[PDB]
Homo-oligomer: A and B are copies of this chain.
Amino acid sequence: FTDPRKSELYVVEGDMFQAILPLRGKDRVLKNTEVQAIITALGTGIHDEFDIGKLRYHKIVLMADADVDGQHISTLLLTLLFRFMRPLIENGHVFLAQPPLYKLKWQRSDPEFAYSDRERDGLLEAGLKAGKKINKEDGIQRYKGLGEMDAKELWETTMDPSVRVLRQVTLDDAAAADELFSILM
């Protein structure tokens, strides 16, 4: 069930087998217990001892808010991977999970989630023109932050491989993270 090439490690930056590990907003970070856990859990070793052979997770999905802070941890973790386990990025293992930004509370249909303003307006338009009703004042929840949503509206919405919205991290993507980290010094 939890075989290496059939499992994923999610890194929920707070502050199908899917493992979940947290990382909170905080270069001796390699000694932060949460980082060591994420690093240990990947099983590939680090720096010169990096061994793609011992990777235990097919996918490494990073989950945070692209609306808060500056992903100071999504840019902090990314740099860590880039200059300690870069092959994980190069071979396309790293990813970003976009949490839902909206919950359309249809009056009598299972709610729907939109991950972009555009998807909202279209889903609203689709639902309405399709005979679905929705309260005009508190019908559309604007998730400020993440996690503060609801377990299962966090699962069905971001862990569900079908409905989830994933965007792979490219070496270019990781390079910027590294620069921004450097510049934030």
Query: Do A37 and B34 touch (CB < 8 A)?
Result: no
A43 within 8 A of B: yes
Chain B residues closer than 8 Å to A54, beta-carbon distance: 33
Q: In the complex where A152-B156, A160-B151 touch, is A15 in contact with B37 (Cβ < 8 A)? A: no
Q: Which chain B residue shows the least CB distance to A22?
A: B2
By a CB distance below 8 angstroms, the chain B residues around A22 are 2, 7, 17, 19
Nearest to A10 among chain B residues (CB) is B20
Closest chain-B Cβ to A153's Cβ sits at a distance in Å of 11
CB neighbours (8 Å) of A152 from chain B are 152, 155-156, 160
Q: Decide if A24 is an interface residue (CB 8 Å cutoff).
A: yes
Stoichiometry (number of copies): 2
A148, CB-defined interface residue at 8 Å: yes
The verdict on A29 contacting chain B, using a C-beta distance below 8 Å, is no
**A147: Cβ under 8 A from any B Cβ:** yes
Chain B residue, CB-CB nearest to A148: B1
The chain B residue sitting closest to A57, CB to CB, is B22
For residue A59, CB closer than 8 A to chain B, the reply is no
> Which of A16, A41, A56, A161 has the most chain B CB atoms closer than 10 A to its own CB?
A41
Check A16 against B160 for contact (C-beta < 8 Å): no
What residues of B have a CB within 8 angstroms of the CB of A20 in the complex?
18-20
1/0 contact string of A133-175 vs chain B (CB within 8 Å):
0000000000000111001100110011100000000000000
With a cutoff of 8 Å between Cβ atoms, the chain B residues found around residue A159 in the complex are 151, 155
